[PDB]
C-alpha cells in the first residue's frame, strides 16, 4: 500500500518539471517509513 | 501454479445469464467494419452449433494506474486490480469504447459500448475492480476471476441489459460480472496454434484445399 | 418537487467553473458530460415551460 | 486451520456447496445472509 | 421529505462563497452515480420515467 501511494506520487509529478517543497516533504515522510518497514523486514528474517 | 493475465494476452469477455432456467454464457463481440456496435455471442451451445469467435477476441495492449493514464492522456505487464486496461478487437484492429450515443429505449442513462478506430482519449479505458470481497485492489488479476468493468470517460460499469426481448450489453450505472477468459499467451514461434487462419497444402506447395469459386454449380460445398 | 429541485440544484452547483473548462482540464469535461447525461436538456425546457 | 481452502462437494452427487446469488430488492431488506445451495458448477470463490 | 434535507446539506458541502468546490463536487458526483437510487424514482435508467 506504501508503494503504491509512492508510485501514484511519482505519477502526479512525473508531468511537472520541479517537485516543490510541500511535495518533497511528503515524500520524505514516506521515505522514512518505508525505511522502517524495509528495516523491520530485514530484522524479521536475519540471523538467517 | 495460478494463471495471471498479462498485457498482449487475447481474451474473451464473458459474462452468463438466465435463459428459461438455463445458464448460458455469452462472449461480448463486435465485427468493426460495417457495424461498430458490440453484441453477444452465445457460446453455451458450442456442442451442436459453433460460435463466431473470430469476432470476440480482444488483447491486452496497455495496463496503466488511474494516475499513470491521467499522465499520459495529458502528454508484458501483469493486470492489477484498480488499473485502466486498453482492449484492442484482433480482427478490426479497434478498440473497445464508451460510445456517445444510446440506442436503447428501456434505459435512459445508458451508453452504447462499441469500436472505436484509435485509441485516443479516456472513451476507450476500462478500470476492473473486483467482484466479491475475495479480491482487493492491487491485487493480480487472475484466470476465471468475476471482473468488474467500469468506463474511465462514463463512469459507467460493462452491463448486460435483460430488460427488452434479447440480450444487450452496454454502459449503465448497474454492474454486472464479466470474466476475461484467456485465448492466448505467448505463442513459438511457427508452430501452429488453434485459431489461426492458414491454408493446407497438399504437395510442394502447389495443390492446397479449397472449395469452388463464386457463383458455381455446386453452391460452393 | 422538492427533492428532485434540491437533486437538480445540487447537481448544478456540482457543475465545474467555466475557467476549468475553458482551460480544457479533463475531470472537469468528464464531470459536465456526466451531469449533462443525467439531465436532459428538453427536460429543463419543460419544467420552465 | 485457517490455510488451506477447502472446496465442499456432496459425494453422491458430485455437487459443490455454493451461495445461491441473492436476488436483486433484496439488499434493501438487510439480508446479507446468502442461502447455501449445492450446484454442478459453483463459483471461483467456493473455497471454505 | 427525507431525501431533500440530505440534499441541502450536500450543496453546502460542494458550493461555497459562490464557486464550487471540484474536491467535493466530484467525490459528491461519484458517490450519487455509484448508488442510483439517490436520484429518485425518476431518471432510474430502466422503466423509471
Given at each position: 500500500r506504501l508503494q503504491e501511494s509512492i508510485s501514484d506520487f511519482y505519477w502526479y509529478y512525473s508531468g511537472k518539471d520541479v517537485i516543490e517543497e510541500q511535495?518533497?516533504?511528503?515524500?520524505?515522510?514516506?521515505?522514512?517509513?518505508?525505511?522502517?518497514v524495509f528495516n523491520s523486514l530485514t530484522e524479521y528474517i536475519q540471523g538467517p | 501454479?495460478?494463471?495471471?493475465?498479462?498485457?498482449?494476452?487475447?481474451?474473451?469477455?464473458?459474462?452468463?445469464?438466465?435463459?428459461?432456467?438455463?445458464?448460458?454464457?455469452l462472449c461480448l463481440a463486435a465485427e468493426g467494419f460495417g457495424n461498430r456496435l458490440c453484441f453477444l455471442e452465445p457460446t453455451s451451445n458450442?456442442?451442436?452449433?459453433?460460435?463466431?469467435?473470430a469476432i470476440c477476441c480482444f488483447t491486452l495492449e496497455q495496463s496503466l494506474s488511474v494516475r499513470?493514464?491521467?499522465?499520459?492522456?495529458?502528454?508484458?505487464?501483469?493486470?492489477?486490480?484498480?488499473?485502466?486496461?486498453?482492449?484492442?478487437?484482433?480482427h478490426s484492429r479497434m478498440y473497445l469504447s464508451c460510445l456517445t450515443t444510446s440506442r436503447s429505449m428501456t434505459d435512459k442513462l445508458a451508453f452504447d459500448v462499441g469500436l472505436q478506430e484509435d485509441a485516443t482519449g479516456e472513451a476507450c479505458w476500462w478500470t476492473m475492480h473486483p467482484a466479491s470481497k475475495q479480491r482487493s485492489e492491487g491485487e493480480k488479476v487472475r484466470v476465471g476471476d468475476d471482473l468488474i468493468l467500469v468506463s474511465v470517460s462514463s463512469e459507467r460499469y460493462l452491463?448486460?441489459?435483460?430488460?427488452?426481448?434479447?440480450?444487450?450489453?452496454?454502459?449503465?450505472?448497474?454492474?454486472?460480472?464479466?470474466?476475461?477468459?484467456?485465448?492466448?499467451?505467448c505463442c513459438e514461434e511457427g508452430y501452429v496454434t488453434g485459431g489461426h487462419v492458414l491454408r493446407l497444402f497438399h504437395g510442394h506447395m502447389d495443390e492446397c484445399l479449397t472449395i469452388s469459386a463464386a457463383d458455381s454449380d455446386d453452391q460452393r460445398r | 418537487m422538492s427533492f428532485y429541485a434540491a437533486l437538480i440544484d445540487l447537481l448544478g452547483r456540482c457543475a465545474p467553473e467555466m475557467h476549468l473548462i475553458q482551460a480544457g482540464k479533463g475531470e472537469a469535461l468528464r464531470i459536465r458530460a456526466i451531469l449533462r447525461s443525467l439531465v436532459p436538456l428538453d427536460d429543463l425546457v419543460g419544467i420552465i415551460s | 486451520y485457517?490455510?488451506?481452502?477447502?472446496?465442499?462437494?456432496?459425494?453422491?452427487?458430485?455437487?459443490?456447496?455454493?451461495?445461491?446469488?441473492?436476488?436483486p430488492k433484496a439488499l434493501r431488506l438487510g439480508v446479507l445472509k446468502k442461502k447455501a445451495i449445492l450446484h454442478q458448477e459453483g463459483h471461483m470463490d467456493d473455497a471454505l | 421529505c427525507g431525501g431533500e434535507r440530505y440534499l441541502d446539506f450536500l450543496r453546502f458541502a460542494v458550493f461555497v462563497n459562490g464557486e464550487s468546490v471540484e474536491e467535493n463536487a466530484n467525490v459528491v458526483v461519484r458517490l450519487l452515480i455509484r448508488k442510483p437510487e439517490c436520484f429518485g424514482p425518476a431518471l432510474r435508467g430502466e422503466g423509471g420515467s
Open positions: 511535495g518533497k516533504r511528503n515524500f520524505s515522510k514516506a521515505m522514512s517509513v518505508a525505511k522502517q | 501454479e495460478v494463471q495471471f493475465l498479462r498485457t498482449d494476452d487475447e481474451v474473451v469477455l464473458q459474462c452468463s445469464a438466465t435463459v428459461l432456467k438455463e445458464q448460458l454464457k458450442a456442442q451442436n452449433v459453433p460460435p463466431d469467435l499513470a493514464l491521467q499522465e499520459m492522456l495529458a502528454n508484458h505487464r501483469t493486470l492489477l486490480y484498480g488499473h485502466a486496461i486498453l482492449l484492442r478487437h484482433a452491463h448486460l441489459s435483460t430488460a427488452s426481448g434479447e440480450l444487450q450489453v452496454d454502459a449503465s450505472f448497474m454492474q454486472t460480472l464479466w470474466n476475461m477468459n484467456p485465448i492466448c499467451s | - | 485457517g490455510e488451506s481452502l477447502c472446496f465442499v462437494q456432496h459425494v453422491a452427487s458430485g455437487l459443490w456447496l455454493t451461495y445461491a446469488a441473492p436476488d | -
